[PDB]
Ligand binder design. Structure first.
Ligand code: TPP
Ligand code: TPP
Ligand code: CA
Ligand code: CA
Lengths: 632, 632
C-alpha cells in the first residue's frame, strides 16, 4: 500500500469508467472519477470473496448513487467477480450484465439502487440485519461492516434522514457512510438548494463524523481506520471534485450525466501516464493488486467456515437458510367472522413462531395493524421492530433484510400510507425478493377518519406494479391460503386487510385462492356473474341470492388476487366469467374491466362518517347493487 | 391576559374537544388536551379575521397533526368562524362540517392535513409563498406569520426534514413551528423509535430553537414573543402531557386515538371547576374573550385595506387574483416534431411571462425536465424555485403555494419519481387546488438508465386517483390544448411527457383534446380502432396504414386524457370506438380495458438499453403490432 500503486489503481478505475460511458454514449462519468480514490483505498479494507458473493459474513458495499454504476462494475471486474471485460464494453446495452443502474442479477451487486436515498436506507437495513444475525449466530460468526457510498442527492431525500435516525437509535457501529461532497448536482451548485451543517445533522442522530479530502490517499485510509473502530454509526464527509482527472470538465455539472468526450478522455489519460490511444486498459500492477481479493477472500471465507464448524449455531443457520414452509400449521378460520387484520395478525404470530428468521414491524401502528408478535420481544434481542413514523425507510430497510441472507421480513402500515413507501416496494418487485407488505384499513370502511385515510386508487397501483402479488382476502381462510402462496412465490406480496369485521365464506365450489379468482356459487346457464374481492364478497353473495329469488341464475366469484387470475388459462377464466359479469370493489378499480362488463366501484374520494353510513352513501348495499345489476 | 382567563379558555377547548370525540364515539382526544394551553395563548398572538378567512395578510395556522381536528374546530367555533356549536356536535358524521381530519371545505381550515409530515411542509410552503408575495407586493402589504403545530409523528417523517432544510436555506423568519413533545405515540413511548437531539437537528438546518413547558402560560407567551422576533425559522419545543387534564389517562398512549370515556370526562370537568353533567359548555368569560377575534380581526383587515388603497401594487394584486387565461398566445407547434418535454418547457415559459403569479421548479432536474423559466431569475426575486432532491416536500410546498391566494405553482420531476411525491399529489386532488405536475421521461423510451428509471405502473396510479387529470400529449399541439384545459379546470393536472422526439400529428377529424380521446383517422365500416396516447400514437397511425394496405378499414384514436374520455357521452364514445378496439401504450395500463377489447401494453419492468432497442424488445414496432391485431 503506497501512493504510486494507489494512484495507478484509482486511474485504472477512472479510465475504465470513462471508456465505458464513452462507448455507450450514455451514462455518468462524474461520480466515478470523483470516487475513484476513495474506492481504491477502500478495496484494501473490504472483506469479501469475489468467488462467493453469498458469503454470509462478507462486508456489504452499497452504491446509493447508483448512477455511479460504471465504477462499481469496474471494481467488480478488477476484483475477480464474474463480470468480464467484454461485459464492461456492453455497458448500458440491451441484455448486458452492466445495465445503467445496478441490478442484483449482476453478481456482486448487493442491492438494486438508482432511486436516490434508497441505498442509504438499505445500508442501514443491512447494518440492522447484521446486528440481528449477530444476536442469533454470535459475534464469532457475524462481525462485518456495511459501507455505503452516497452523494448530495441521497442526503437531500427524506428517506436518508429517516433511516439515519434509526441507525443512531440502534447504535449501528457496523455502519460506515461515505458522503461524496462535491458541491455539484444537475442544476449546478448544491448551494442553490442545500446548506445544512451536515456534521451537526448527523451528530444529532448519534453518528461520529469525520471530514476528509477524498483525493488524499493517506487521509482516506486514516478515516477508514478510525471509522472501523467507532462506537457509533460513522459518517465520512469526503470533499471531492466531480470528474476529478478530467481537465476542463473537473467540477462541472456537465460531467454528471453525459460522456466526457473523446478528446477530454485523451487529455486525461496523457496527464495520468496512460496511453490515450487505447481503451479498456488495465495496467499489470493494478490488475494483480485488485485481483488479490480472490486469494485473500478465499482465505477469509475458509477461516470463517472453520469457525462455523465449531459453532453451536450450525443447525440454526441451516434452518435459517432452508425454511420449511410446508410444515407450518396455520390457524383454522373456517366459519369464523373476523376482520382480516385480525386473521392476518394471528398468521403473523404463527409464522414468527415457526420461522426463526421471520420478523418485522409497523410504522408506529402495531396495535392498529395487529402486527405485534406477542411475547417475541423487541429488536435486537427479539423480533418486533419499531420503525417509528417512517414508512419509506421501513420498506427500504426491510428490502435489505430480505437480501441479507437469513431473514423473511414484513413491513406494515395503513393501506393509504402505502403511498409513502411505494418507491421502495418497487425495488422489492424489481429484485423479486421475499418481502411481505401488510396494509390494513383498506377502504372507505375506515369510516370516521375520512377521505385522507380511505384508500381509493392504491389497489390499482399495486396491481399495476409488475412482480408483485396483491392479495385482498375476504376471510381468514383466504388470508391463510394467500400466505401459503406468498411464501412459495418468487416475488413479493402485499396483503390488503380490513379494519371491520367480515363474514366467513362457504367453501370453494370450483378453483381456489391459488387461481386468483374462484367460484363460491355456480349456476347452470348463469345470466350474471358477480366478481368481488375482500369486504365486497358478502355483498355479492347476498345480491346473488336476491337475484336468484327474482329468477336470475348467478355465479359469484371471489377474486383475492388479480395478478394470479391474469395468469389462468382461458378455459378456467371462461368457466368463472359467465353471462354479464359485474365487478364490485370498494376501490376505483378500472382494471376490473379486464374481466368484467360492468364495474361497481368508487370514483371519488371518500367521506368522514360511520362505516355503515359511508358504505351506504357510496352504494354498497344489496338493494343498490341489485338495482344496478338489473339496470333500473 | 391573566392565568385565570387562560386556564378557563384552555379548559373550554379541552372539554369541547373531549365532548365531541365522546359524542362521536370516535376520534383523538389526547393531542387536543395536550395542546389546549398552547392554543389558548396563541389565540392572543394570531392575526386573523374570522369573518374573512381569505384575508391575504392573515397569519396562517396549520395543524400538521390533523388528528387533533376537534381542537381546531373548537377554536374556529369559539373565535367566530362559520362553524356552529351544532356542527361541533356532528363531529365525524356523514356530511358534517367537522370531518375526522380537516378539509378546506370547512372555512378557517388553511390546508387539508392528516397524512403526517404534510402540514409541516405545507407550513414551509406558506412561509415561502409569503416571502414571494412580499417580494411582489411589498412589506407594507405582506408581513404575517405562519404557525404550525406538529407532533412526534410529523418530525419522524422524511418530508419534515426535507421541508425544514429548505426553510433554513431560505431564512424563513416568518415561520414558527411548535412541536408538541409528549413522549407518546401509538406504540407507546417515543423512545422505542426515536431519540434524536431535536434541538441540534434543527439548528443544523438553520433554525432558532426554544424549549418550553407547554402547560406554563407565561413560558408559552414568552416563547411566542421571542419567536416572533427571530431572524431564523423558529422551532418551539413544547414539552406536554398527552391528555393533560384527563386524570388516569394523562400520559397514556390509550388517549391518542379513542374516546376518554364518560367517567373520565366527568372527573376531569370536576377537577377543572366545570359541571360534569353538562356537555358542550362554553363559559361566558371564555366565549367573550375568544370571540373578540371578530372585532380585532375586522379592525386589522380594515387597516390593511387602507394600506392597499395607498399602494402602487393595487393593480398587480388585481391581476394576480383574476388571471386571464383566455388572452394567452401559446406556441404554435403544428407540424413540428419534438419531444413533449420540450414543447412543455416552451409553454411553461409562455405562461410564466403572461402570468405574474405562475412559478415553480424541479427537484434538481430543471435541465432534464426542461422547466427553467429563462431569464425570470431565482426565488425569491425571480420565479425559478430550486427544490433540491426533495420531490415530496416540493409537492407539499407547492400545495401551499396554490392555497396562499395569488399563485399558480408547478412541481416537476421524472415520472418514475412521481412515486416519491404521490401522497402530496393526493392532497392536491382532495382539495381540488390548481397545482400542475410536470412528469418527463414517461416510458421505457428513457432507454439506458434502465428499469428503475422506466415508468410502468405510474399512469394507472394517476388515472385511478380521483380529481386529477392526467394528460399524456402526443405532440406540441396536444400539449397546448392540455394546458388550456388544465388552467380552466377545477382540479389539478399532471403532464406526462417524453424524453424522446415524437412526430407531429395531423389535425383532428372528429372531436378534440377537450373530449379526452378523439379521432385522427376515421373509416367507414371500420374493422379495427387503434387507441393510443403520447408516444404510441404514431405507431398506431403507421399500423393503421399498413392494415388499410392489407384491406382493413381502421379508426385511430388519440387519447391524451383518460379521465376526460370517461366523462364523454355514450354517443361520442360509440363513434370513436368501432369494430375490435385495441389500446396501445408503453405502460401497464389494464384500465384501457374500459374502452378496448385488447390492450397492447407492457406487463413487466423494463430494460437498460438504447431506446430503439428497448421499444423493439417490448413489441413497439409496426410489424409486431400489426401481427397482434391480425391475431397471427
Ligand atoms: C428519487 C430520485 N430523484 C431524482 C433522481 C435523478 N438524479 C440522479 S443523480 C441526481 C443528482 C444527484 O447528485 P449527486 O447525488 O449530487 O450526484 P453526483 O452529481 O455528484 O454524481 C438526480 C437528481 C434519482 N435518481 N432519484
Ligand atoms: C404518513 C402517516 N402515517 C401514519 C399515520 C397514522 N398516525 C396518526 S397519528 C400517529 C402517531 C402520531 O403521533 P403524534 O404525532 O406523536 O401524535 P399524538 O399521539 O402525540 O397525538 C400515527 C402513526 C398518519 N396519519 N400519517
Ligand atoms: Ca454531488
Ligand atoms: Ca406524540
Amino acid at each position: 500500500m503506497n501512493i504510486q500503486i494507489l494512484q495507478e489503481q484509482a486511474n485504472t478505475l477512472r479510465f475504465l469508467s470513462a471508456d465505458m460511458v464513452q462507448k455507450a454514449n450514455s451514462g455518468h462519468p462524474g461520480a466515478p472519477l470523483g470516487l475513484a480514490d476513495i474506492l481504491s483505498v477502500l478495496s484494501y479494507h473490504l472483506k469479501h470473496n469475489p468467488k462467493n458473493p453469498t458469503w454470509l459474513n462478507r462486508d456489504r458495499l452499497v452504491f446509493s448513487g447508483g448512477h455511479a454504476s460504471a465504477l462499481l462494475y469496474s471494481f467488480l471486474h478488477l476484483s475477480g467477480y464474474d463480470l468480464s471485460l467484454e461485459d464492461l464494453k456492453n455497458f448500458r446495452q440491451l441484455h448486458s450484465k452492466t445495465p445503467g443502474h445496478p441490478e442484483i442479477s449482476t453478481l456482486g451487486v448487493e442491492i438494486a439502487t438508482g432511486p436516490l436515498g434508497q441505498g442509504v436506507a438499505n445500508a442501514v437495513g443491512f447494518a440492522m440485519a447484521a446486528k440481528k444475525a449477530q444476536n442469533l449466530l454470535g459475534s464469532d460468526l457475524i462481525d462485518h461492516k456495511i459501507y455505503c457510498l452516497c452523494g448530495d442527492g441521497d442526503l437531500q431525500e427524506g428517506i436518508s434522514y429517516e433511516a439515519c435516525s434509526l441507525a443512531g437509535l440502534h447504535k449501528l457501529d457496523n455502519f460506515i457512510l461515505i458522503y461524496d461532497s462535491n458541491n455539484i448536482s444537475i442544476e449546478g451548485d448544491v448551494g442553490l438548494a442545500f446548506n445544512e451543517n451536515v456534521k451537526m445533522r448527523f451528530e444529532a442522530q448519534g453518528f461520529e463524523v469525520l471530514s476528509i479530502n477524498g483525493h488524499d490517499y493517506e487521509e482516506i485510509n486514516k478515516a477508514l481506520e478510525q471509522a472501523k473502530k467507532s462506537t457509533k454509526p460513522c459518517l465520512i464527509i469526503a470533499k471531492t471534485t466531480i470528474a476529478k482527472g478530467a481537465g476542463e470538465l473537473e467540477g462541472s455539472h456537465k460531467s454528471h450525466g453525459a460522456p466526457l468526450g473523446e478528446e477530454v478522455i485523451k487529455k486525461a489519460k496523457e496527464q495520468a501516464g496512460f496511453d490515450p490511444n487505447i481503451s479498456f486498459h488495465i495496467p499489470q500492477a493494478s490488475k494483480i493488486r485488485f485481483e488479490s481479493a480472490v486469494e485473500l477472500g478465499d482465505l477469509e471465507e475458509a477461516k470463517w467456515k472453520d469457525k462455523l464448524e465449531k459453532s453451536a449455531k450450525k443447525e440454526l443457520l441451516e434452518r435459517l437458510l432452508n425454511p420449511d414452509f410446508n410444515k407450518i400449521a396455520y390457524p383454522d378460520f373456517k366459519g369464523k367472522d373476523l376482520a382480516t387484520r385480525d386473521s392476518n395478525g394471528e398468521i403473523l404470530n404463527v409464522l414468527a413462531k415457526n420461522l426463526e428468521g421471520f420478523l418485522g414491524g409497523s410504522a408506529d401502528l402495531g396495535p392498529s395493524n395487529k402486527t405485534e408478535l406477542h411475547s417475541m420481544g423487541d429488536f435486537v434481542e427479539g423480533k418486533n421492530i419499531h420503525f417509528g413514523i417512517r414508512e419509506h425507510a421501513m420498506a427500504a430497510i426491510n428490502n435489505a433484510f430480505a437480501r441479507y441472507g437469513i431473514f423473511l421480513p414484513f413491513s406494515a402500515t395503513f393501506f393509504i400510507f402505502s403511498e409513502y413507501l411505494k418507491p421502495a416496494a418497487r425495488i422489492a418487485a424489481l429484485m423479486k425478493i421475499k418481502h411481505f407488505f401488510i396494509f390494513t384499513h383498506d377502504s372507505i370502511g375506515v369510516g370516521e377518519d375520512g377521505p385522507t385515510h380511505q384508500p381509493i386508487e392504491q389497489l390499482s397501483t399495486f396491481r399495476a406494479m409488475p412482480n408483485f402479488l396483491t392479495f385482498r382476502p375476504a376471510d381468514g381462510v383466504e388470508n391463510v391460503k394467500a400466505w401459503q402462496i406468498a411464501l412459495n412465490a418468487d416475488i413479493p406480496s402485499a396483503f390488503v386487510l380490513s379494519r371491520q369485521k367480515l363474514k366467513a365464506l362457504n367453501e370453494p365450489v370450483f378453483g381456489d385462492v391459488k387461481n386468483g379468482a374462484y367460484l363460491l356459487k355456480e349456476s347452470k346457464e348463469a345470466k350474471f356473474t358477480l366478481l368481488a374481492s375482500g369486504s365486497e364478497v358478502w355483498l355479492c353473495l347476498e345480491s346473488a341470492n336476491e337475484l336468484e329469488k327474482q329468477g336470475f341464475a348467478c355465479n359469484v366469484v371471489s377474486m383475492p388476487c388479480f395478478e394470479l387470475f391474469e395468469k389462468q388459462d382461458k378455459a378456467y377464466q371462461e368457466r368463472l366469467l359467465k353471462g354479464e359479469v359485474i365487478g364490485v370493489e370498494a376501490a376505483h378499480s378500472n382494471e376490473l374491466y379486464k374481466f368484467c362488463h360492468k364495474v361497481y366501484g368508487i370514483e371519488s374520494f371518500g367521506e368522514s362518517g360511520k362505516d355503515k353510513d359511508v358504505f351506504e352513501r357510496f352504494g354498497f348495499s344489496v338493494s343498490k347493487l341489485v338495482n344496478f345489476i338489473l339496470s333500473k
